Amino acid sequence: ERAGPVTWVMMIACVVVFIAMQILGDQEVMLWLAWPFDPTLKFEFWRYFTHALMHFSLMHILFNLLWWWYLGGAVEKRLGSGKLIVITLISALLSGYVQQKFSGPWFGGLTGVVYALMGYVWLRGERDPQSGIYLQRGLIIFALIWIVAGWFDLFGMSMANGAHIAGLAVGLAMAFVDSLN
Ligand SMILES: CCCCCCCCCO[C@@H]1O[C@H](CO)[C@@H](O)[C@H](O)[C@H]1O
Ligand SMILES: CCCCCCCCCO[C@@H]1O[C@H](CO)[C@@H](O)[C@H](O)[C@H]1O
Ligand SMILES: CCCCCCCCCO[C@@H]1O[C@H](CO)[C@@H](O)[C@H](O)[C@H]1O
Ligand SMILES: CCCCCCCCCO[C@@H]1O[C@H](CO)[C@@H](O)[C@H](O)[C@H]1O
């Protein structure tokens, strides 16, 4: 098999934006894609979402897209493109919102979305085995190591932990809902 359309297009888009950032510089791209950083930009609606497409180091984009490929790919294949779209939109909005509230509008990346996917896949598997969706034991360990890395700012460039929690909460909430139904 291969990655579905949403999984694939997100990966492509992030790579393209990362290349633009190397060519033009990070700030030049943030000017266009960052969460609104001035009142004159509040109705540029793409900005509530496009922050998720920007990454600020090789490790940032590499591990984000690895988790996205694996977890997003599984969700899309087993549960449909629509499911992945909604998890992605809600988690990007809410984690972005909490991030800007605590730390300002200059941020970006899929880290909040990955937290949501981790929470979703794990909880869905823990509550509802018959879905085909779950987070294997071994990968729980490595997910935790990735979480710890960001939680303790072990690379200096991490989001607010409140933003992490916000993303995780979206994934857990959606999995809870899907496990009831
Ligand atoms: C540190 C991050 C953890 C990385 C875990 C390994 C990721 C391996 C991804 O596998 C790929 O997944 C796609 C959708 O799930 C499939 O379409 C594809 O056939 C399969 O090869
Ligand atoms: C986590 C969510 C992932 C980010 C999704 C960002 C989608 C942004 C789409 O931008 C839109 O592109 C159009 C094409 O021209 C423009 O006409 C329009 O003005 C612009 O708003
Ligand atoms: C520093 C990053 C190191 C990543 C090492 C990944 C270990 C191997 C994981 O493989 C993946 O395991 C999943 C569950 O078995 C399969 O669903 C998937 O298809 C497969 O690709
Ligand atoms: C459903 C949305 C929930 C959002 C919750 C956000 C507020 C949580 C507070 O977290 C604490 O405060 C700081 C957060 O940035 C971190 O310094 C600290 O490590 C963390 O423990």
Author numbering: 91 to 271
Quote the study's own text.
Intramembrane proteases are one class of membrane proteins, which share the property of cleaving transmembrane (TM) proteins to release cytoplasmic, luminal, or extracellular domains that move to new locations where they can carry out their biological functions. Rhomboids, first discovered as part of the epidermal growth factor signalling pathway in Drosophila, are characterised by a core of six TM helices. Structures of the rhomboid protease GlpG from Escherichia coli and Haemophilus influenzae have revealed that the catalytic dyad serine and histidine forms part of a water-filled cavity separated from the external medium by a flexible loop and from the bilayer by TM helices. Substrate proteins are thought to diffuse laterally through gaps between TM helices to reach the rhomboid active site.
The first one was obtained from a completely delipidated protein for the wild-type (WT) protein in a trigonal crystal form (space group, R32) and diffracted to 1.85 Å. The structures of GlpG WT and S201T in this crystal form are largely identical except for a small difference in L5 (rmsd for Cα atoms excluding L5 is 0.15 Å). The hydroxyl of Thr201 points away from active-site His254 and is within hydrogen-bonding distance to the side-chain amide of Asn154 and the imidazole nitrogen of His150, both residues being part of the oxyanion hole, thus explaining the inactivity. The mutation of serine to threonine results in a displacement of side chain of the active-site histidine by ∼ 1 Å. Of the 18 fully or partially ordered detergent molecules in the trigonal crystal form of GlpG S201T, many take similar positions to lipids, binding in grooves and crevices in the protein and demonstrating how the native structure of GlpG is preserved in a detergent environment. Six detergent molecules surround L1 and two occupy the space beneath it, thus preserving the structure of L1. BNG514 observed in the trigonal crystal form occupies the space between TM2/TM5 and protrudes into the active site. Such an insertion of detergent results in minimal structural change involving only a partial displacement of L5 in particular residues (residues 245–247). Glycine and proline are residues that are known to introduce kinks in TM helices, and it is probable that the TM helix of the substrate must bend towards the enzyme thereby juxtaposing the cleavage site of the substrate with the active site of enzyme. This detergent molecule may be mimicking a rhomboid substrate bending towards the active site. A small displacement of L5 lifts the side chains of Phe245 and Met247, but Met249 in the present structure still plugs the cavity near the active site.
